[PDB]
Ligand binder design. Structure first.
Ligand SMILES: [Zn+2]
Lengths: 783, 472, 559
């Protein structure tokens, strides 16, 4: 059948979130970085952060809360499982031992309801008596916070307003009152509701609804002393202690909207803010002799696009940037040209988001490196990840990295890019300005135009920044052989997308050739509209376009003519050609198996995944098994079911192999981290380097009963069942994973205790006991 | 084509529906021209007018054909014919609602729909009293009721169609319009309803058997005895029992009224023979279910109508009907043995009160006493044909003079009130005493003929051992 | 002053139970002395009066005459609190009234009727006339009686399960019209693309045959989403659809970094999918995911989702003023789109109707699925608390002729499955009430006698009645004269136990549209059938007989 071993090589480095507070002690501040599938405790020290233990968690953290309720010395961590499973966590120690226990447990999953695309908003009231959870638009679930409550149960309060932008609590009030901005067709406004546990309903708050801007989004809670509500829209920053209106509108905010914020002063006088670019801001609240007197803003320099900010001791702010590396920024009194009153105290590494990568062993002789296109724009950097073990060489491009392929005629790396220029004077100095040679394409058949920037392999310097025309946007890039010519041509599928048109009607696929430092054009093939990812079928350029999948034949007279006319496809977003099988990945038609026939001249539809799932990444393992990734973080391997009875079901791909992954795959590759039965790698957005090893039939049964017997012994924080979590989030079907081996659980056996090994090997007699301890080391030595 | 002219009408009306589904298509695109951003608007307008012309032309031909099928009139003919007119109302109802958007065309369907509901009100009423109102205690005298007793009546219609789950509740009203002086009032004192289930109607028929109908002794409010016993006596008063039939089928609210035959209701049981004579005199000269003044004027019926009328009193009661040889003596006993004419207008008073010579017995009392005695002893000698029945002495003494000697016969005595008698010829014809039912109670006439020997050959030559051999 | 003298006919013989009610609530008049209190001064000048007859009764005081028959007393039992299936009771009479309004409904929206959320707020408002522990058992029946006229009422006027069956037959006829596009000339390769939208090829893309059940699952709607969008890029290119084409084109490009789409596009319009609406009637259902239909004016989209949130587009389909809805379109209005002919635009219009009819088919299905569970939640919670109250009544009766009949029937309601299946459980629940011998203080005999008193204009128990019972009580005298709704017990519903199953609601009874043609029509004026008379009676007008005159017992006590 289809048996695969999914094992990770590196932990996710993208900072999903962070929360600070006295977790371990009452005086020791602790930064709990809630990353993907893990929660790491960091002791705030003079040197910065000090790790003690990283506690793994089932999937991402939807809601994270570090709060101390009335009568508690330790922060009560609140973790919401991605399968909507709420559990109150409590820190416990017995001799400098990191052992977080569980105060309460109860699932909050609902059978019906439209999920909030904005996100599940989880907040705790200032009185620490209820749980403010916004699961669905218009559906508020409140869990009674009691000291003697172990079963977490949330009742359904029908929020009158169907759709809301952001929900917050009114800090400073002596009642459970909230401040939320609802969304109406007549205009978005703010309202106050009372969450009374005695009536189980919403009630009129202190003041009525207020007329705000029709663009107001992020809501910043005003602390207890000042009182009120600060709502920042696209530009205006309004203040509403009561029926007072104090709105300041800085033009700089209009462009870069406020995304995150940070409370430096407990009073609320200094409130650090974060925009969508990285420029650091800080509000200045002055208590009018508490009502606000005036509101000012300042620029504190630019950082990597952040997401969650937490204030530490001695003026330290943790910048949890997801796009680009995360750096510990220490607030100081220094001043310069940009007035950046901040310094880079520490610098942490990051691998995601991996847009594109490839395994090249030119000077590696096996054990090829990983050129992950991490970050975007200014944070766009080619992290040269190479196993020794993983050394990371940051190559800053200051421009968005798009597609990268391997060129064997000039030992370089052709990387597409789309720099941002204010409408068109440039803004940031990208690699194009730092390049050697620049020219435009010949034919002609704010703004982010596509530009081809080929970078060397050893010098890491852009040799040619050959840009394209205006309104020219590429989507694919093939750097392999075409026809009988062994030279790796640069077939770039560009498109003439006009800013006034709404449908793709003009395009031009150009072909170039890199010859000893010179990007010389070959010819051009104008097309209709925008094209998608294309892969050369045995050298022959197989076109993708949109619905019409063609095969352009390369001749000897410099001409590319079409030879196929396949209209069954709707989208060629994930087109892969292996052997003779042509696998087109459609968004709605999912996996479609094709086959080219020279005697006919068209791809015959032989197999097709009957499930209409939204694909995200495809991969061809063998001639019958094909791995597919879904947008709902689920893996599935379909088998070739072309030998049935009815001619209708023969075109249906039987899905047997099914897996619950958790991460979003963006690109696939082929290789391994060892020089000289599986070599399938893929880059994820969260920064997880994954390896799929096609396990054999004799080795699949050795870990089948071992994984099932380990779920009832090694549990997570909250007595949560592992198999229950290992279920798909697919809307079509919610099923437990079948046909796969979870590598994560197998890894736990390497650092497991000594007497715990006999509890899982005594029920297996391989023709056993000590043999299972040696065979698990080979699964980790392959990367 | 008594059975083919109904099956072809189903596909004939359905043939128009084959063009109606295509007509709705032309009507759909016609309405699509509403707020169009226009030369195709007038093209579809004139095309829809010509497409709706042949629909109303062929439909008029099917209307005249459905009217000729009803004029022919068995139960199965109106079964399939009613289903044709029932489904026909479904295509015209949706066409009238679709013609409200200015199609000239809305008035063309109203004139055709008016003829559909008019024909439905004609065939339904035409469609009957199967079971006549008779009492369970009556032996062979139907159409006779009594106060305090119950009776049954079935107004089953030929139509065999009903609604999905609608119980067609119907009622029976008695003495509602026949309150004329001389008629008494009789009202049911118990439930007079009938719950007709759809199941027993779509497969069996619209059976409205009203049962358990009690009667009360009441008179007119304002005039009692004398007024209701004058022009019409208790035994001669006609009472028409109405039956309000309520038929509902897809909003077709119709309240029919099937009037039954007039009956005679008496207040006692000893007057059953006299009351039966008034019924026979009413269903002989006419056969109309609606009659008010019938016995007020003295009638005169000839002998041509009393022939087959008296034969029903022996054919149904015992078995053997009155042969023409028996009817020849009934005329001589009422008018004369030397009668030559047959158009003698016999009055009603000369039927039950005028004595019959030479016995000096009334005609009705003599015949009623005959059927009473022979129904308890002479029941096996009437059906098979061992006796000849009513034979006068004038005709019996004529045929015996042409036969052989030793033969005997069995006839009815005219000097007495009935019974049985014997006679034979040895020329001289003998006679015995008439034996009534009191003599046959201890010993029937079977052993009397055998052990008697003058009796030998029964009319004419049948040996006494072969005729009465099965009765031994 | 303005008195009223009834008249009872001798029809329908004499029952032993009816003789006790008449003797204790009616007085029969005989001569003139017994009727002299109402001003019956008869002048003996009338001819008929002198003829020994009691006719031409001369009256000094005008009154009201009612021609009451005994038959009407036998029907009274079907009009009382315990009528068709009602509970045996001061407020129970008004309960039967409003319950008939749910059943006898011509074409009113089934959503306007009280649902589970508001039904409970009234459960504690029921009052009773003489124990306190027995009031919880009587009130535990009306919680399930609402589902008898709707959920358990198959093929009846205005019902939710029966409304699904009409949508299946309408969806089949709708697909027959869209395959007739090519057949009818009035309506190249354009006639073959419409055939792919038919369910004959949609069900083949998954692996299920074309039956009467494939158009009800949730996975079937995911396959039709790809066939709809394929008719908007090839057949059409209007500026309305063109705006949504760039949205789905830039969506797949924003997914390369794992981010969403911020407020960047300023020329965007309110699409049909981003409509946030909810059914006010339903307690909690969530924002409906409206389909991504196009070719609709911005002024016609707001009015479409207005009725959807309120009456779910029912009146324009089945109800009043239904002829004007066909001139514009019941599922979607007749819109205008450029670059298309009257036949080109017609095709994509029928495809958008099936994209909305199939989406609405899952809405009405899911709403009853959620309701079947919402009704099961209060039913399972009621049987868990009502079995405890009756348990304390048994222990108190033992410590202090109907004692052994309580413990033998209290454990019989625990073996019910309460799930499908669940239809036969409600038939056996009402059988336990009849087995429980009620005390003489509270029986059905007295409840019936009290009913007649409320029907007259001389006695009244309650003046204020609920809105549902305002029109519902008009049906009580209707049943007395002619009982439209006869005893509907457990036995009748047992035979036709159509469980809430996809393979039972659509199938089963198919030829049930014959009675529906006259059912709704009958209920239109059924609220005005009340036998009452208030015309003044003079000396020589309305002449009847003295012996047939009848008066109530309360009329003699007032004089
Ligand atoms: Zn369009």
């Amino acid at each position: 059948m289809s048996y695969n071993y999914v094992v990770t090589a590196q932990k996710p480095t993208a900072v999903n979130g962070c929360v600070t507070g006295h977790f371990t002690s009452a005086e020791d501040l602790n930064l709990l970085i809630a990353k993907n599938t893990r929660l790491e405790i960091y002791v705030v020290t003079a040197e910065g952060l000090r790790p003690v233990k990283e506690v793994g968690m089932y999937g991402k953290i939807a809601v994270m809360e570090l709060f101390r309720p009335k009568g508690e010395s330790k922060d009560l961590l609140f973790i919401l499982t991605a399968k909507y499973n709420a559990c109150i966590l409590e820190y416990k120690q017995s001799g400098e031992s990191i052992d977080i226990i569980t105060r309460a447990h109860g699932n909050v999953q609902d059978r019906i309801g439209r999920p909030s695309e904005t996100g599940i908003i989880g907040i705790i009231d200032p009185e620490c008596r209820m749980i403010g959870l916004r699961l669905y638009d218009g559906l508020f679930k409140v869990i009674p916070l009691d000291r003697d409550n172990k079963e977490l149960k949330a009742f359904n309060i029908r929020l009158e307003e169907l759709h809301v932008i952001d929900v917050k609590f009114l800090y400073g009030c002596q009642a459970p009152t909230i401040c939320f901005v609802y969304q109406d067709p007549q205009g978005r406004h703010v309202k106050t509701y009372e969450v009374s546990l005695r009536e189980k309903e919403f009630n009129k708050g202190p003041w009525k609804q207020e007329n705000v801007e029709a663009e107001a989004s992020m809501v910043i809670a005003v602390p207890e002393p000042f009182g009120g509500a600060i709502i920042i829209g696209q530009e205006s920053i309004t203040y509403h202690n009561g029926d007072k209106y104090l709105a300041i509108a800085p033009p700089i905010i209009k462009q870069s909207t406020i995304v995150c914020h940070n409370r430096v002063d407990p009073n609320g006088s200094r409130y650090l803010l974060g925009d969508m670019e990285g420029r650091l801001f800080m509000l200045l609240l002055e208590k009018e002799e508490v009502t606000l007197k005036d509101l000012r803003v300042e620029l504190l320099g630019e950082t990597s696009i952040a997401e969650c900010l937490t204030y530490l001791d001695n003026g330290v702010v943790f910048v949890g940037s997801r796009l680009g590396d995360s750096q510990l920024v220490k607030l100081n009194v220094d001043s310069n040209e940009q007035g950046s009153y901040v310094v880079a105290m520490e610098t942490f590494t990051n691998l995601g988001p991996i847009v594109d990568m490839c395994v090249v062993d030119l000077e590696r002789q096996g054990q090829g490196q990983l050129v992950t296109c991490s970050g975007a724009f200014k944070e766009g950097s080619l992290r040269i990840i190479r196993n020794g073990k993983l050394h990371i060489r940051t190559v800053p491009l200051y421009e968005s990295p798009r597609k990268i392929c391997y060129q064997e005629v000039s030992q370089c790396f052709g990387v597409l890019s789309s720099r941002i220029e204010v409408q068109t004077t440039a803004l940031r100095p990208s690699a194009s300005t730092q390049a050697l040679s620049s020219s435009v394409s010949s034919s002609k058949l704010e703004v982010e135009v596509h530009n081809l920037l080929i970078i060397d392999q050893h010098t890491f310097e852009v040799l040619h920044a050959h840009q394209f025309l205006q309104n020219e946007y590429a989507l694919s890039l093939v750097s392999c052989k075409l026809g009988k010519d062994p030279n790796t041509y640069f077939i770039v599928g560009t498109a003439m997308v006009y800013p006034e048109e709404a449908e793709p009607k003009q395009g031009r696929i150009v072909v170039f050739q890199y010859s000893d430092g010179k990007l010389q054009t070959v010819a051009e093939k104008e097309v209709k509209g925008a094209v998608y990812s294309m892969v050369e079928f045995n050298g022959k350029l197989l076109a993708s376009i949109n619905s019409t999948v063609r095969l352009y034949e390369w001749t000897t007279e410099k001409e590319l003519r079409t030879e196929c006319n396949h209209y069954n496809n709707i989208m060629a977003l994930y087109l892969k050609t292996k052997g003779d099988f042509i696998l087109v990945g459609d968004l709605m038609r999912s996996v479609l198996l094709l086959a080219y026939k020279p005697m006919e001249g068209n791809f015959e539809e032989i197999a097709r995944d009957f499930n209409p799932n939204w694909m995200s990444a495809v991969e061809i393992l063998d001639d019958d098994n094909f791995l597919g990734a879904e947008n709902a973080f689920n893996l599935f391997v379909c088998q070739k079911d072309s030998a049935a009875t009815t001619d209708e079901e023969r075109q249906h791909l039987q899905e047997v192999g099914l897996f619950h992954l958790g991460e979003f795959v963006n690109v696939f590759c082929h290789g391994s981290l060892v020089m000289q039965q599986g070599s399938v790698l893929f880059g994820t957005v969260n920064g997880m380097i994954g390896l799929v090893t096609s396990l054999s039939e004799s080795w699949y049964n050795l870990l089948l009963d071992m994984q099932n017997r380990l779920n009832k012994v090694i549990k997570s924080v909250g007595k949560i069942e592992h198999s229950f979590w290992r279920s798909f989030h697919t809307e079509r079907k919610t099923e437990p994973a079948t046909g796969f081996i979870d590598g994560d659980l197998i890894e736990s056996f390497l650092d497991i205790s000594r007497p715990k090994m006999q509890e899982v090997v005594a029920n297996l007699q391989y023709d056993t006991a000590d043999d299972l301890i040696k065979v698990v080391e080979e699964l980790t030595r392959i990367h | 084509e008594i059975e083919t002219r109904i099956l072809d009408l189903q596909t004939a009306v359905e043939a128009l529906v084959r063009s109606i589904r295509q007509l709705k298509d032309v009507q759909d695109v016609f309405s699509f021209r509403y707020t169009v951003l226009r030369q195709l608007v007038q093209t579809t307008a004139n095309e829809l007018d010509r497409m709706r012309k042949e629909v109303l032309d062929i439909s008029k031909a099917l209307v005249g054909r459905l009217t000729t099928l009803v004029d022919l009139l068995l139960e199965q003919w109106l079964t399939a014919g009613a289903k044709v007119l029932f489904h026909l109302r479904q295509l015209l109802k949706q066409l009238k609602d679709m013609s409200l958007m200015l199609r000239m065309f809305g008035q063309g369907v109203d004139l055709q729909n008016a003829q559909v509901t008019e024909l439905l009100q004609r065939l339904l009423q035409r469609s009957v009293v199967e079971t006549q109102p008779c009492m369970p205690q009556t032996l062979h005298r139907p159409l006779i009721l009594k106060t305090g007793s119950k009776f049954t009546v079935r107004t089953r219609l030929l139509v065999r169609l009903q609604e999905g789950n609608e119980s067609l509740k119907a009622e029976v009203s008695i003495d509602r319009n026949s309150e004329l002086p001389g008629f008494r009032k009789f009202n049911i004192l118990t439930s007079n309803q009938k719950s007709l289930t759809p199941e027993e109607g779509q497969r069996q028929g619209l059976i409205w058997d009203f049962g358990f109908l009690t009667l009360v002794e009441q008179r007119s409010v304002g005039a009692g005895k004398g007024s209701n016993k004058g022009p019409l006596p208790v035994t001669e008063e006609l009472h028409i029992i109405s039956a309000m039939v309520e038929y509902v089928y897809q909003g077709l609210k119709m309240k029919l009224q099937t009037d039954t035959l007039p009956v005679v209701i008496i207040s006692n049981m000893n007057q059953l023979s006299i009351a039966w004579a008034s019924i026979l005199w009413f269903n002989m000269l006419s056969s109309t279910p609606k009659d008010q003044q019938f016995f007020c004027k003295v009638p005169k019926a000839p002998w041509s109508l009393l022939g087959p009328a008296l034969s029903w009193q022996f054919s149904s009661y015992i078995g053997r009907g009155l042969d023409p040889e028996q009817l020849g003596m009934l005329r001589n006993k009422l008018f004369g043995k030397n009668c030559k004419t047959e158009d003698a207008l016999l009055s009603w008073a000369d039927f039950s009160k005028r004595e019959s010579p030479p016995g000096k017995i009334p005609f009705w009392t003599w015949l009623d006493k005959i059927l009473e005695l022979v129904h308890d002893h002479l029941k096996d000698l009437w059906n098979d044909g061992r006796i000849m029945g009513f034979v006068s002495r004038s005709e019996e003494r004529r045929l015996l003079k042409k036969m052989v000697s030793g033969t005997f016969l069995l006839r009815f005595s005219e000097t007495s009130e009935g019974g049985i008698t014997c006679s034979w010829v040895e020329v001289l014809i003998y006679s015995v005493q008439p034996y009534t039912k009191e003599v046959l109670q201890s010993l029937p006439l079977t052993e009397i003929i055998r052990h008697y020997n003058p009796l030998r050959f029964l009319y004419p030559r049948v040996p006494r051992d072969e005729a009465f051999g099965c009765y031994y | 002053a303005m008195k009223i003298v009834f008249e009872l006919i001798k029809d329908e013989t004499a029952d032993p139970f009816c003789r006790k009610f008449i003797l204790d609530n009616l007085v029969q008049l005989k001569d003139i002395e017994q009727a002299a209190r109402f001003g019956f001064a008869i002048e003996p000048g009338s001819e008929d009066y002198n003829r020994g007859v009691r006719s031409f009764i001369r009256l000094k005081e005008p009154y009201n005459h009612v021609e009451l028959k005994m038959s009407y007393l036998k029907n009274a039992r079907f009009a009382t609190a315990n009528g068709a299936y009602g509970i045996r009771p001061a407020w129970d009479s008004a309960i039967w009234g409003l319950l008939r309004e749910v059943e006898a409904v011509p074409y009113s929206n089934p959503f306007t009727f009280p649902t589970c959320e508001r039904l409970e707020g009234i459960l504690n408002r029921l009052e009773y006339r003489p124990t306190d522990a027995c009031r919880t058992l009587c009130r535990a029946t009306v919680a399930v009686q609402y589902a008898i006229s709707i959920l358990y009422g198959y093929d009846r006027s205005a019902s939710v399960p029966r409304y699904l069956r009409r949508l299946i037959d309408e969806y089949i006829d709708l697909q027959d019209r869209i395959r007739r596009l090519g057949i009818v000339p009035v309506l190249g390769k354009d006639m073959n693309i419409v055939q792919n939208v038919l369910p004959e090829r949609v069900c083949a893309q998954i692996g299920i045959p074309f039956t009467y059940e494939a158009c009800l699952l949730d996975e079937y709607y995911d396959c039709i989403e790809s066939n709809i969008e394929q008719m908007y890029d090839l057949l059409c290119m209007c500026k309305e659809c063109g705006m949504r084409r760039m949205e789905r084109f830039e969506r797949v490009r924003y997914n390369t970094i794992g981010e969403r789409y911020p407020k960047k596009k300023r020329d965007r319009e309110r699409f049909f999918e981003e409509n946030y609406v909810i059914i006010h009637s339903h307690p909690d259902l969530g924002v409906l995911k409206l389909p991504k239909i196009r070719h609709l004016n911005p002024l016609q989209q707001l009015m479409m989702c207005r009725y959807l949130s309120k009456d779910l587009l029912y009146d324009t389909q089945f109800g009043p003023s239904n002829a004007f809805s066909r001139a514009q379109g019941v599922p979607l209005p007749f819109s205008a789109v450029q670059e298309t002919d009257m036949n080109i635009a017609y095709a994509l219009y029928l495809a958008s109707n099936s994209y909305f009819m199939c989406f609405l088919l899952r809405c009405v299905r899911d709403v009853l699925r959620h309701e079947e569970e919402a009704f099961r939640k209060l039913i399972l919670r009621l049987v868990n608390e009502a079995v405890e109250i009756i348990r304390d009544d048994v222990n108190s009766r033992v410590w202090a002729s109907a004692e052994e009949r309580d413990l033998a029937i209290a454990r019989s309601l625990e073996e019910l499955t309460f799930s499908n299946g669940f239809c036969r459980d409600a038939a056996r629940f009402l059988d336990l009430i009849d087995a429980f011998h009620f005390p003489k203080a509270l029986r059905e005999h007295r409840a019936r006698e009290d009913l007649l008193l409320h029907t007259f204009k001389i006695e009244k128990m309650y003046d204020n009645r609920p809105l549902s019972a305002y029109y519902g009580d008009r049906l009580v005298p209707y049943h007395v004269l002619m009982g439209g709704h006869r005893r509907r017990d457990g036995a009748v519903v047992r035979t036709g136990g159509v469980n809430l199953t996809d393979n039972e609601i659509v199938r089963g009874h198919w030829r049930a549209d014959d009675m529906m043609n006259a059912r709704l029509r009958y209920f239109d004026s059924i609220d005005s059938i009340e036998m009452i008379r208030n015309v003044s009676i003079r000396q020589e007008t309305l002449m009847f007989d003295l012996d047939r005159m009848y008066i109530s017992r309360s009329e003699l006590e007032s004089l």
